[PDB]
Design an enzyme around this catalytic site. Structure first.
Site, PDB file in Angstrom:
ATOM      1  N   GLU A  79       6.232  -2.755  -2.272  1.00 49.26           N
ATOM      2  CA  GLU A  79       5.808  -1.503  -2.072  1.00 49.26           C
ATOM      3  C   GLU A  79       6.435  -0.265  -1.736  1.00 49.26           C
ATOM      4  OE1 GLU A  79       2.358  -2.390   0.802  1.00 49.26           O
ATOM      5  OE2 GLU A  79       1.181  -2.303  -0.208  1.00 49.26           O
ATOM      6  N   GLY A 104      -7.785  -1.508  -1.945  1.00 50.96           N
ATOM      7  CA  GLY A 104      -8.891  -1.979  -3.096  1.00 50.96           C
ATOM      8  C   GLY A 104      -9.773  -0.955  -2.745  1.00 50.96           C
ATOM      9  N   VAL A 137     -10.665  -8.699   0.726  1.00 52.45           N
ATOM     10  CA  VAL A 137     -12.056  -8.629   0.834  1.00 52.45           C
ATOM     11  C   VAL A 137     -12.216  -8.659  -0.780  1.00 52.45           C
ATOM     12  CG1 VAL A 137     -13.860  -7.018   0.501  1.00 52.45           C
ATOM     13  CG2 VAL A 137     -12.457  -7.699   2.283  1.00 52.45           C
ATOM     14  N   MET A 153      -5.064  -3.636   4.785  1.00 53.75           N
ATOM     15  CA  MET A 153      -4.660  -5.106   6.171  1.00 53.75           C
ATOM     16  C   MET A 153      -3.958  -3.953   7.175  1.00 53.75           C
ATOM     17  SD  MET A 153      -5.048  -8.464   3.949  1.00 53.75           S
ATOM     18  CE  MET A 153      -5.157  -9.534   5.718  1.00 53.75           C
ATOM     19  N   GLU A 154      -3.843  -3.342   6.506  1.00 56.64           N
ATOM     20  CA  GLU A 154      -2.419  -2.025   7.765  1.00 56.64           C
ATOM     21  C   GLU A 154      -3.063  -0.384   8.226  1.00 56.64           C
ATOM     22  OE1 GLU A 154      -1.984  -3.430   4.160  1.00 56.64           O
ATOM     23  OE2 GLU A 154      -0.930  -4.972   5.099  1.00 56.64           O
ATOM     24  N   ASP A 192      -7.455  -3.260  -7.279  1.00 54.06           N
ATOM     25  CA  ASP A 192      -8.252  -4.375  -7.348  1.00 54.06           C
ATOM     26  C   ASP A 192      -9.387  -3.072  -6.506  1.00 54.06           C
ATOM     27  OD1 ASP A 192      -8.655  -4.661  -4.781  1.00 54.06           O
ATOM     28  OD2 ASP A 192      -6.729  -5.359  -4.668  1.00 54.06           O
TER      29      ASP A 192
END
Ligand SMILES: CCCCn1cc(CCCSC[C@H]2CN(Cc3c[nH]c4c(N)ncnc34)C[C@@H]2O)nn1
Ligand SMILES: CCCCn1cc(CCCSC[C@H]2CN(Cc3c[nH]c4c(N)ncnc34)C[C@@H]2O)nn1
Ligand SMILES: [Mg+2]
Ligand SMILES: [Mg+2]
Lengths: 230, 232
Positions: free
Chosen positions: B15, B82, B156, B176-177, B200
């Site tokens: 990233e 996601g 997920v 997640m962050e 995704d």
């Protein structure tokens, strides 16, 4: 001069720490925490509660290290027992800790594992040895074992048994792994002490409310005895 | 003070690779707390770039280090996410209006899911920065959505969990962050913007989609982040 960071998660876990040390503290606000700074037996002690959970405790531990220059971090608080031989009020020192709620299994990683880290985070051998020595001198039972940390209060048979089967954990809480993790990243010795408040089952909320004060005091008293040896 | 210092964060090396490349300036590498911070100067601003490593604890640590060690006055996050909603497709950009830690559960004490005492379910980001993002997206003729981002320490990849995130938190994307980065910024009074490009659909195929689209989606977000820094 020695600078020692002392952490709990909740106000109730540090109330007995502040009282037992019995010295005057300067209150210093930073990053949404209040740090209580004092001098005790030629040591600077910095006491704070992080607030509950992994993000809170990660932040506060990082602030302790970066802003206050602590050379060791000792955590004191309460925990849920996962094993029959850890009863209400019993003390445990964490040998290793895990973030039990981490799940990257979609990429075939074991539960608890994050790339560029490890499932189990180690604490200080020298400090854990000191704890065991003083417990033996005091004739208090001190267990050692794995502590599982996550961002859920565990209150079910199913989840308890998962923590035991997956990680061989002895106790559960919401901060130890994050505190120990931060300390590892900065090369700062860490000891995590917990006194049992509940059995992490369907009655845990009620047990926790009943025993928080007493269990917090038990851990705080032991933490003070450790600082007396540093 | 007298100089502007901007923190730029991703979660993964992938990233920040396009961020470092796109800025095209020389960076000094500074190790601290298990991260490497890339410090340079760009258009009269000090920029500090780092990837935190994955998840809430990593990102909390790194954001706190950025603020305390490097004195950043703003934090811009760039990375992938996601999608939880049909109108957010692979490669689409989202700016987070609010964020939640979706895996927080103190329901045993009758707290709503996501809530911790002495905090809040939803963490706000910077209105001024989000307004800037919307303005430049309109100028660039790129779709920019805004919405709630849910963050937790799980990747997920199921219908059941996706649908929980939508029903419980009205979230548009999952990662997640973001919530941890925004939370730290809130505690220190530092303006924060969280940008994500979709990699995704957070369903049973998400692992494969993520591996395929990480590079492209990371570049899409990085390019947009650079366009924001150009306006600061
Ligand atoms: C603080 C605001 C006043 C009202 N108030 C208090 C509370 C209590 C929230 C407590 S969360 C749990 C604490 C204790 N602590 C250890 C713990 C002990 N037993 C555990 C268990 N079974 N599962 C997980 N963790 C534990 C984790 C958290 O700091 N909620 N609202
Ligand atoms: C240095 C060695 C790295 C080796 N390596 C890479 C990996 C891949 C781990 C990727 S964890 C996910 C990243 C992406 N990121 C966003 C994301 C996008 N889609 C999501 C979804 N469906 N659920 C939750 N989060 C996401 C979260 C995390 O940083 N495993 N081993
Ligand atoms: Mg002796
Ligand atoms: Mg439905």
């Amino acid at each position: 001069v020695q600078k020692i960071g002392i952490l709990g998660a909740m106000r109730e876990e540090i109330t007995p720490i502040l009282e037992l040390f019995g010295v005057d503290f300067e209150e210093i606000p930073l990053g949404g925490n209040v740090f209580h700074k004092g001098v005790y037996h030629n040591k600077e002690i910095i006491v704070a509660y992080s607030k509950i959970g992994k993000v809170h405790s990660t932040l506060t531990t990082t602030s302790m290290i970066l802003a206050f220059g602590v050379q060791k971090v000792l955590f004191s608080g309460v925990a849920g027992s996962l094993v029959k031989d850890l009863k209400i009020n019993d003390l445990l020192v964490a040998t290793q800790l895990v973030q039990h709620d981490v799940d990257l299994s979609a990429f075939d990683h074991p539960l608890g594992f994050i790339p560029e880290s490890a499932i189990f985070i180690e604490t200080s051998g020298s400090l854990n040895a000191l704890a065991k020595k003083i417990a033996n001198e005091q004739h208090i039972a001190l267990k050692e074992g794995v502590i599982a940390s996550g961002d859920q209060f565990v209150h079910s048979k199913e989840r308890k048994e998962f923590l035991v089967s997956e990680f061989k954990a002895s106790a559960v809480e919401m901060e130890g792994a994050s505190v120990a993790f931060v300390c590892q990243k900065f090369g700062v010795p860490c000891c995590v002490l917990r006194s049992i408040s509940d059995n992490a089952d369907e009655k845990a909320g009620m047990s926790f409310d009943e025993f928080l004060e007493k269990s917090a005091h038990t851990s705080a008293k032991f933490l003070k005895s450790m600082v007396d040896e540093l």
